[PDB]
Ligand binder design. Sequence first.
Ligand SMILES: OC[C@H]1O[C@@H](S[C@@H]2O[C@H](CO)[C@@H](O)[C@H](O)[C@H]2O)[C@H](O)[C@@H](n2cc(-c3cccc(F)c3)nn2)[C@H]1O
Ligand SMILES: [Cl-]
Length: 138
Amino acid sequence: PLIVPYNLPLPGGVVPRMLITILGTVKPNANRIALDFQRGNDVAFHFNPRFNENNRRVIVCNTKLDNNWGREERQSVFPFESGKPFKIQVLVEPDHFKVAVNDAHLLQYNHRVKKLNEISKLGISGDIDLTSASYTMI
Ligand SMILES: OC[C@H]1O[C@@H](S[C@@H]2O[C@H](CO)[C@@H](O)[C@H](O)[C@H]2O)[C@H](O)[C@@H](n2cc(-c3cccc(F)c3)nn2)[C@H]1O
Ligand SMILES: [Cl-]
């Protein structure tokens, strides 16, 4: 597969109509996964499934600016399952990132970092076997 943590360059940043697809399998007994859309050292969009936060499964989304995390956005719809294959699709829309997992809409995250063409890397980390990571225009 691919080595995790994995860095996927996004040449020229992101733009509306760009679709990022991540395929992999959650490890048995996973604890956490993260996708980090990065603008240099800043994290424009952190998407962070947590499998055991006080015995609850939750997705935490946030932005990191100058090494400081901001206000978390939380989603208790939790489509991941330890040991199972998944597909994450992140569609860049004008106002938000739109995320679907296994072909079901999951959440939107409003753009806090607005220089979309500087969000030039995607980091993929945590407790997965990573099969592929790619992008296309729709
Ligand atoms: O806000 C989002 C932020 O949250 C804190 S935790 C937070 O701490 C505060 C302050 O104490 C509490 O108030 C919050 O209640 C709690 O949520 C995580 O450490 C951050 N994080 C996770 C990873 C990571 C790395 C590799 C793999 C992976 F899957 C995930 N790297 N950094 C990030 O998720
Ligand atoms: Cl975490």
